[PDB]
């Protein structure tokens, strides 16, 4: 499927490979949880693995189902 990926400088959403049909969205109190925090690494995936205690990636089985918690251009 397609899921927003922050891989690129800007923001966008492409169709994962023939190995991922899900969608994720990392998150962690970045080095600025004070103002920023929670780094969403929008992207795609075939599922949701273990994950870290601080750095966790969401999961979904639909396109644009793992958007940003602040989605917005510029």
């Amino acid at each position: 499927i397609v899921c927003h990926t922050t891989a690129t400088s800007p923001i966008s959403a492409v169709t994962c490979p023939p190995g991922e049909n899900l969608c994720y969205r990392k998150m962690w109190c970045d080095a600025f949880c004070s103002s920023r925090g929670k780094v969403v690494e929008l992207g795609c995936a075939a599922t949701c693995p273990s994950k870290k205690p601080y750095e966790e990636v969401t999961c979904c089985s639909t396109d644009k189902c793992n958007p940003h918690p602040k989605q917005r251009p510029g």
Partner: peptide, 13 residues
Amino acid sequence: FRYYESSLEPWDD
């Protein structure tokens, strides 16, 4: 490089 909850800039907003 991510959309950091801060914004959507490739560098913590």
